[PDB]
Amino acid sequence: LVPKLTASVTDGAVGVTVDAPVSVTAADGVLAAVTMVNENGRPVAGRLSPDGLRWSTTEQLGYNRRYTLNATALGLGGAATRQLTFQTSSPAHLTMPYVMPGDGEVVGVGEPVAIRFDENIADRGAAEKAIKITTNPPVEGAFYWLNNREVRWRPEHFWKPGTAVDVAVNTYGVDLGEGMFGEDNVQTHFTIGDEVIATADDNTKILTVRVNGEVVKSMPTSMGKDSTPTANGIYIVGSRYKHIIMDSSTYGVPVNSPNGYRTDVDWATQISYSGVFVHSAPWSVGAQGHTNTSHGCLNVSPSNAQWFYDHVKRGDIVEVVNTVGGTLPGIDGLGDWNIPWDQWRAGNAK
């Protein structure tokens, strides 16, 4: 019996995806040498196994390349040699993923996994498949798309604190549809911090912060006036500013219109892309606890706003109840938890 050479590609193959290493195997013999070069002749790095039976590329393979594999096998039954040439994927387009939250970070119990792509994803299912979420302790979750470029992942309920989350975005080599392929892989790992949930009740006009179930702060607040009310629902804490200029046009309301505004404020914590912040409002302290007067934000006293900035982190939860507003859109950017689990779990990959 002569040595037999088997590869994970075949001679003449086209559209070989490069999301996987290329391998050669010997049977009834051992591999004497294996090489793989591109058209230019540039070698691809490989590795033979100690027992001489298996060889595998150890380097990333390129898009739009023709590769040539040469292998020799020897055995008691004589020798064997194959030459294979194959052609890899040639994308029409490349898309790059950006993953949040940031790596190593510790975040609140409402933080979703987010993958944003710089281009429109025609085959959402393929993108979902290439994204591998690991959770410790394990918990079940699901993918949902807020728009054509960004997919989110989260459990049915708020994370239990102390949970490790690993996000492996392995889109390199993956067809995301209409000839779009991943430009790269990205990998983030984060931990879930303390449970922090702040409830804003319009009936009482108090924002109450609860850390691991204990009340630790009680803030009189002035929310949005009836003409421009604060939406009820769940808000996820986003970014935090010592000071910031709030510009109504950044959220699609012309500064120059009636509900327009441009305000320089202190100690602001964004809780929706739609432009809701908890921020310091000295100008309404007499209204806080009593009357709604804002364009939508949660007005608090300077010292309470700064307290919020210092003790609330990305991913903590703010819940608004009993306002005259509607509900905060689930596809807001920070309003993911307002979408019913059955609807979220069903996803929208198609």
Author numbering: 58 to 407
Publication passage describing the model:
The final step of PG biosynthesis in Mtb is catalyzed by two different classes of enzymes, namely the D,D-transpeptidases (also known as Penicillin Binding Proteins – PBPs) and L,D-transpeptidases (Ldts). Conversely, Ldts catalyze the crosslinking of disaccharyl-tetrapeptide polymers by forming a transpeptide bond between the third amino acid in adjacent stem peptides thereby generating 3 → 3 crosslinkages between mDAP residues. Mtb lacking LdtMt2 is severely attenuated for growth, virulence, has deformed cell walls and exhibits an increased susceptibility to β-lactams.
apo and enzyme reacted with biapenem or tebipenem, and collected X-ray diffraction data at 2.49, 2.18 and 2.45 Å resolutions, respectively. All crystal forms belong to the monoclinic P21 space group with similar cell dimensions and contain two molecules per asymmetric unit. The RMSDs are 0.4 and 0.3 Å between apo-LdtMt2 and LdtMt2-biapenem or LdtMt2-tebipenem, respectively, and 0.17 Å between the holo structures for the same 702 aligned Cα atoms aligned. Interestingly, the electron densities in these complexes are similar in size and shape. The observed densities are larger than the glycerol molecule observed in the apo-LdtMt2 crystal form but smaller than expected for an intact biapenem or tebipenem adduct as illustrated in Fig. 1d. The glycerol molecule found in the apo-LdtMt2 crystal form is disconnected at 2.7 Å from the catalytic cysteine and poorly overlapping with the larger and connected MTOA adduct.
